[PDB]
Amino acid sequence: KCSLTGKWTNDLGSNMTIGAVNSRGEFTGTYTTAVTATSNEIKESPLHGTENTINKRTQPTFGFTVNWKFSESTTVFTGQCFIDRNGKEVLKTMWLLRSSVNDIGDDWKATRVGINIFTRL
Amino acid sequence: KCSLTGKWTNDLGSNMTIGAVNSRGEFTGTYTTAVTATSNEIKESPLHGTENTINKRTQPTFGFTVNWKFSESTTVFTGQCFIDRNGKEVLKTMWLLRSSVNDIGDDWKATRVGINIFTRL
Amino acid sequence: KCSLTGKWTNDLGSNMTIGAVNSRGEFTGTYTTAVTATSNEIKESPLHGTENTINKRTQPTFGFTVNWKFSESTTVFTGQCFIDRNGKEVLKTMWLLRSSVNDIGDDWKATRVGINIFTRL
Amino acid sequence: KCSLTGKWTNDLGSNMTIGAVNSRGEFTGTYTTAVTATSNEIKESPLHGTENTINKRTQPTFGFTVNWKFSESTTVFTGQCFIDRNGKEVLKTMWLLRSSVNDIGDDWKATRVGINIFTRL
Numbered sequence: 001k002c003s004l005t006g007k008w009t010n011d012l013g014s015n016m017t018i019g020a021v022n023s024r025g026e027f028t029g030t031y032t033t034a035v036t037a038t039s040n041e042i043k044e045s046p047l048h049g050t051e052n053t054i055n056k057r058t059q060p061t062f063g064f065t066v067n068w069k070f071s072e073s074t075t076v077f078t079g080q081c082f083i084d085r086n087g088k089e090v091l092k093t094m095w096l097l098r099s100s101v102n103d104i105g106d107d108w109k110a111t112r113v114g115i116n117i118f119t120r121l
Numbered sequence: 122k123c124s125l126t127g128k129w130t131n132d133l134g135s136n137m138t139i140g141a142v143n144s145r146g147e148f149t150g151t152y153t154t155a156v157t158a159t160s161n162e163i164k165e166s167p168l169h170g171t172e173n174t175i176n177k178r179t180q181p182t183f184g185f186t187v188n189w190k191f192s193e194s195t196t197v198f199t200g201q202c203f204i205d206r207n208g209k210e211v212l213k214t215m216w217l218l219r220s221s222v223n224d225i226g227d228d229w230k231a232t233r234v235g236i237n238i239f240t241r242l
Numbered sequence: 243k244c245s246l247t248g249k250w251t252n253d254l255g256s257n258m259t260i261g262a263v264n265s266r267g268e269f270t271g272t273y274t275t276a277v278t279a280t281s282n283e284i285k286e287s288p289l290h291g292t293e294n295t296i297n298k299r300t301q302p303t304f305g306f307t308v309n310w311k312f313s314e315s316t317t318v319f320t321g322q323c324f325i326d327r328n329g330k331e332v333l334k335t336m337w338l339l340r341s342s343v344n345d346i347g348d349d350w351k352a353t354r355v356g357i358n359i360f361t362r363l
Numbered sequence: 364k365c366s367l368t369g370k371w372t373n374d375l376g377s378n379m380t381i382g383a384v385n386s387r388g389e390f391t392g393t394y395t396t397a398v399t400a401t402s403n404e405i406k407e408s409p410l411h412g413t414e415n416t417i418n419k420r421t422q423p424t425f426g427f428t429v430n431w432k433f434s435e436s437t438t439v440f441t442g443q444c445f446i447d448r449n450g451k452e453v454l455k456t457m458w459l460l461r462s463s464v465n466d467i468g469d470d471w472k473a474t475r476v477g478i479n480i481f482t483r484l
């Protein structure tokens with residue numbers, strides 16, 4: 001049983017906390033990013049997502065959206081919860097980071113991509 | 122003012138419907154995909170997402186997750202709502218489609234990527 | 243028979259020219275990008291790539307690298323040559339644009355992604 | 364001075380060997396993948412690429428194409444050569460793996476994406 005509910009930290013030092021997952025797979029959380037110039041104001045942003053219920057799975061796929069505070073951007077993450085090495089949980093994700101452009105001719109360059117591995121904190 | 126609420130169709134023939142967007146940017150919807158072997162059972166899946174409120178924008182960025190029915194997979198979409206040509210709305214998105222693997226050594230191959238352009242239906 | 247050799251232009255207005263493809267699938271070319279601030283100096287960059295020979299195909303897959311002039315960046319493209327509508331050739335590609343960072347802690351953000359459709363010029 | 368010439372192995376167990384890089388940044392090599400069902404026939408495929416010369420760099424960006432044997436597919440990799448921890452070289456890459464489809468209506472699903480970290484062997 002690989003469960004998203006809990007405290008996680010990514011290979012970049014960002015922390016997220018994901019709350020309860022309901023009957024329909026939905027969850028909510030907060031994301032505290034490690035990626036910005038130091039603000040005395042704590043950079044928290046909400047997140048919302050769903051995990052796949054088809055078949056229970058116990059290593060389900062999932063997705064979620066972060067709507068960044070103090071930024072026009074959105075990141076989406078998707079991945080799967082794995083469980084191994086006497087029970088250590090890992091989320092393997094890939095993401096897209098969408099920036100905002102003000103002219104559709106710059107759309108082509110508005111999207112970044114990479115990976116994040118999240119482990120229990 | 123570029124608004125996600127409404128009926129959209131993608132370059133593949135999939136239809137989605139997105140409901141009201143609340144004060145915190147959240148929305149819900151359904152996704153009817155054009156991509157599967159014909160089921161007499163209508164393939165609808167929910168979606169959940171958020172759009173970026175920072176600054177009103179009127180061409181905001183956004184993300185959402187689709188949790189596919191009759192499949193172990195999840196797609197995440199992210200993009201921006203544009204408005205042009207005497208007022209025609211377009212969503213330019215990129216997506217990741219995560220499949221489910223049963224062994225972490227196949228993780229590397231579980232993620233697809235592409236684009237979708239969504240126009241009003 | 244879908245052939246890469248020739249003159250192509252992308253949905254952004256960039257032009258490329260690809261030369262002969264040899265027995266081992268290799269080719270060379272030039273890329274004239276539409277994407278930069280107007281230089282009186284013509285922005286041409288070489289490209290090098292290969293296409294897949296396994297089975298002849300006539301709609302083969304392929305990849306190539308552009309090593310951008312006056313920039314520290316590299317783009318890689320990959321795709322397939324299609325042929326349709328009384329014989330119109332199209333290259334459907336996706337790309338990654340790698341920027342240069344000077345500190346490995348910014349690596350995560352150095353890669354962009356999108357699509358390009360190339361048609362005969 | 365971070366140099367691509369040499370022997371590398373990836374987080375999946377694949378080995379590649381990259382030869383000399385010339386004045387124009389070009390190189391050639393072989394790729395021995397860890398990713399297939401065991402063939403008594405050694406799975407080697409050529410690769411061809413370029414690295415960015417603008418400014419010498421010593422941590423340049425680069426790209427290359429692998430044209431897979433016994434497969435219709437092509438992978439493209441792009442990244443940057445880093446150097447750290449008393450001199451340990453690392454290539455951080457992202458890739459696209461293009462499969463072959465026989466009908467352009469399946470194009471949307473033909474491309475995978477992920478990362479590879481390559482270290483000296």
Ligand SMILES: O=C1C=CC(=NNc2ccccc2C(=O)O)C=C1
Pocket residue numbers: 010012014033034035036068069070071073075095097116
């Ligand atoms: O103002 C901003 C804009 C974008 C951001 N992206 N963060 C990410 C994007 C992709 C993957 C991980 C992260 C992270 O912060 O951990 C953070 C703050």
Ligand SMILES: O=C1C=CC(=NNc2ccccc2C(=O)O)C=C1
Pocket residue numbers: 131133135154155156157189190191192194196216218237
């Ligand atoms: O059983 C499944 C599994 C995956 C699916 N992906 N659909 C998509 C994935 C990416 C972009 C567009 C679509 C779409 O259906 O329009 C659909 C049904």
Ligand SMILES: O=C1C=CC(=NNc2ccccc2C(=O)O)C=C1
Pocket residue numbers: 252254256275276277278310311312313315317337339358
């Ligand atoms: O100085 C630079 C840096 C990056 C560039 N990327 N061009 C591209 C990247 C991806 C897809 C298409 C293009 C293009 O120019 O058509 C061009 C000039």
Ligand SMILES: O=C1C=CC(=NNc2ccccc2C(=O)O)C=C1
Pocket residue numbers: 373375377396397398399431432433434436438458460479
């Ligand atoms: O027949 C095939 C088809 C595709 C392959 N892709 N390999 C890869 C694709 C992306 C990243 C790393 C690898 C690898 O083999 O290390 C290998 C053999």
Ligand SMILES: *[C@@H]1O[C@H](CO)[C@@H](O)[C@H](O)[C@H]1NC(C)=O
Pocket residue numbers: 009013014015032033034121
């Ligand atoms: C995340 O939490 C850990 C442990 O509480 C802490 O060391 C780290 O500074 C936190 N990171 C951020 C970005 O808040």
Ligand SMILES: *[C@@H]1O[C@H](CO)[C@@H](O)[C@H](O)[C@H]1NC(C)=O
Pocket residue numbers: 130134135136153154155242
């Ligand atoms: C989407 O809606 C349009 C118009 O109602 C219709 O022609 C099309 O068949 C629908 N597609 C799907 C996949 O339901």
Ligand SMILES: *[C@@H]1O[C@H](CO)[C@@H](O)[C@H](O)[C@H]1NC(C)=O
Pocket residue numbers: 251255256257274275276363
């Ligand atoms: C590409 O070629 C076409 C036709 O020759 C021309 O109109 C266009 O300006 C060229 N674009 C660039 C960026 O050189």
Ligand SMILES: *[C@@H]1O[C@H](CO)[C@@H](O)[C@H](O)[C@H]1NC(C)=O
Pocket residue numbers: 372376377378395396397484
């Ligand atoms: C790569 O080389 C190492 C060391 O020579 C070896 O252990 C490994 O089996 C090789 N892998 C492949 C896929 O050839």
